[model samples]
Target: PHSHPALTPEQKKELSDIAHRIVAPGKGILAASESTGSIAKRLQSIGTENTEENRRFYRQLLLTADDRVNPCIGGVILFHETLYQKADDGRPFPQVIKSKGGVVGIKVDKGVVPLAGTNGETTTQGLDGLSERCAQYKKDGADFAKWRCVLKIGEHTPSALAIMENANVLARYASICQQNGIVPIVEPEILPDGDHDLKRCQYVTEKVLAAVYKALSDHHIYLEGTLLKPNMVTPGHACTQKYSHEEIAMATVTALRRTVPPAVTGVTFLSGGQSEEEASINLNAINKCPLLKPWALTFSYGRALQASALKAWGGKKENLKAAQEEYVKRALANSLACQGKYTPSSNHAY
Candidate 1:
């Protein structure tokens, strides 16, 4: 609470502008770039070499996506290192995004830091200099900022301290970005890191989101200038039980409706380590669930959007075109999901 406590009318208006632009009908964000360490773990799973050039090549193919990627993917969240890089043709990555009608974004969290005396929960860092960073990024043509705060599910998970801490950090981050004329994509990831059931996931998500909105209100952050990137309610990955897409959809939507504020710009779900196909399928089903979802239910996926493209490219120049095609395919499918029109065939890669 040490920061400025009041947002001038001008600042509120600026934040509202960014929020409306992002949640405009039929548009959502694309999380294209991943940290080196995160990508390394993913590459190791598939027995591929995790080199810097390989990572660059993968992202290059995605950013330079052909015309198909623009329709569903309105914004792209780039890693810090990526925002400074360029395409093979020397064009800045943000310019490439703008040329395709996409807003450029940067992830500002310094990864997650552990909370003392908490059960495996963490809060996002990087608040120390976020205001200055947002200003510089705006000068660099970035329109939005992303910070991910993760939560876990356990008998004692979503501890009050964890919820309050993460929510306050998110509020502070958003307030700073709005002051600097940048949109903030507030992502609070409730990790499906255990054998918790779907109901438990839903309960935890509701609690965390409620706390987030309350904190945002208390901090005087402009909701219209913010977006919510939350986890879809589902059982843990290792659960033996399988739920239909409709079931997952119902659970997810109900929780969101109960906790999310309609005043916020939009709600995009994180793939949260879901497989590419699973992420698409779930998002499609979420939109199709026939529940009264109040806001746009879309994706801000990282691995879900890039897993197949990376495999198709396999770090070869010859595969770049194919990789781009795959990227377009995923984007198009998710775009359809945004409109609640996706089908099983939408999961097709080629």
Candidate 2:
């Protein structure tokens, strides 16, 4: 391995430590960072207005879960608004998360924009003023940040330009984040919306990740100081072919082992619209796969972690404990799954 050192030894160690703690054995991240527009849809489902108070109430429910979730939840990713919002006890969300032995993270992307020449494919924006934003976030109690870039598996989609451009953009974002003492979570999400088979997903995933790492290398980004938030290898939602959890695990692990450098601190898989049980089962299988995993493989789930909890909350203060209980159940389940200790059952009532 050639040394083109960008971050100092101390910076590298600091990022590596934060990354490891977020994905330590028996722990994963709660992706509570849905943008206001995204959370509006969630609120709509429960017949609640997307008011700031409602959003704060919902987020507080997750951030203030019972002590049992303390060990299961290693970190949380917050939206810009929630980072400044206070809990019912008047504590800021970041302070509440830190008190529970969890790291505070922020989502810094400005969302996706269409690529004019592509067939509805898009890339993430937000590089504008990112360095300054990262510095402010670090001072505001965030130790990590997330940016999402999406790719699609289609006959002529995710073109070469898309892959190269998005990878370089991610590298740039990561380079800036580390400069300000923030660990970047590189999220290259492959959408599950097509008729592609598992093999196709694996192929695209390998190609995209390969380009991403190369760009990171070109930008002199420190691999050991970063984390990956990738989509799990699986057939598209509209695909006809079916795959087992074990098969999904095999494909996922194979792609990462082929492309991701071992120096990357961890890989936290996005649930990618999977149900709570399905996500947990697949994570367990990934952990159980007989492969030589070099980094921690865990979760950075949004819907998979909060579906039942959101449903339980229904935008009512009276349901706060119920919502927290649902959140805790998923946290505990995913924690066990990350450790290869989860037992699959049909009793997923919550």
Candidate 3:
């Protein structure tokens, strides 16, 4: 934790205002951005090389799409680099997003740092100068912030120490951001790294969240003023067995209900590299499940939202329009899914 003073009244009010607007009845955020390395891995699977121009182009297309997304996506989180990039038409992407009624956000945590005594896993770290950074980002039009702490599924993973440590760090970050008037998206991503079953994933998720909420409570953090970017309950990528979307939805919702507080304004699921269609289908199922979801069950997807767009664009100017169209299609479909209005027939490509 940094040696900064506690939050001021004005800062709290600023964060609260942003939170109220974002979690307003039927809306949530869209994490259409991702780190360059993660984007590279996705591109490699499709036989494409990852480059700076490609990444900027992909996100530019997503952020500058026709105004169709403003209705469903209340916020859009960007990587540091993308935040400074401009659309082909020379308009700043953040300004474009705001003009369309979407709150602009930035992923603030420097990627996760390894925790000693863990099973080769890590927690996020960026507090050294986060307060100053948040202030600058707010001045640059970023209304919210994000930090992702990774926990892995294992026989005894996410140790109590790891959970408490990560959760406290997140709370500290959130607390500081609120003092600066930037709503923090507290994301504790439990990686699908092992061949663990869905039940194990659920168990780990429940424990992790329980620790997180307790930390928030301990810190006297305002729940309604924060967002949770989490992973859906699902088996690991290496697991041979497949589960139905219904099963995933049931486990995911049950786990969240058991741990998360209703005070949280929204719960945005990270794609964790799920295929775009698969991620959308699973999110739709979650919304349709006969469970009482207290908070918005939406997405903060990265690769899932941009994979097709990147492929279609291939870093070419002529393909920019087509890429933007594809981006809008994914965003619109996910928007409907978030509202529980998506159907199997709505799963078609643009």
Task: Provide the clashing-pair count of each candidate structure.
Answer: 0, 0, 0
* Alpha carbon deviation, residue 164, candidate 3 (Å): 1.8
Misplaced by over 4 Å in model 2 are: 1-5, 346-350
Ranking by lDDT: 2, 1, 3
lDDT of 3 by residue, 283-334 (tens): 9999998878888888887777777787787667788888878777788788
> Could you report the Cα RMSD, in angstroms, for every candidate shown?
4.5, 4.1, 5.0
Model 2, 1-350: lDDT tens digits are: 68766778898889989988998888899999999898888999999999999998889889998899999988999999999999878899999999999999999999999988888888889999999999999999999999999988888988998999899999999999999999999999999889999889988999999999999989988888899999999999999999888888889889999999999999999999999999999999999988889999999999999999999999889999999999999999999999889997711110
lDDT at 113 for candidate 2?
Answer: 94
Candidate 3: Cα lDDT at 143: 90
For every model shown, what is its TM-score relative to the native structure?
0.93, 0.97, 0.90
lDDT of 1 by residue, 1-350 (tens): 46664677787787777666666666778886578887887677656688876677677888887777777777899988889888889998899888888889999889999899997778889999888999999999898989989888877888899999999999999888888889899998998888877878888888888999999989887787788999999998777788777778888888888888888778888888888777888888888876677777777878778878877877678988987888778888777777778786611100
Instruction: List the pairs of residues colliding in candidate 1.
Output: none
**What lDDT would each prediction earn against the true structure?**
0.83, 0.92, 0.81
Instruction: Name the TM-score of candidate 1.
Output: 0.93
Q: Return the TM-score for candidate 2, rounded to 2 decimals.
A: 0.97
- The local distance difference test score of model 1 is 0.83
Collision pairs in model 3: none
Better of 1 and 3 by lDDT: 1
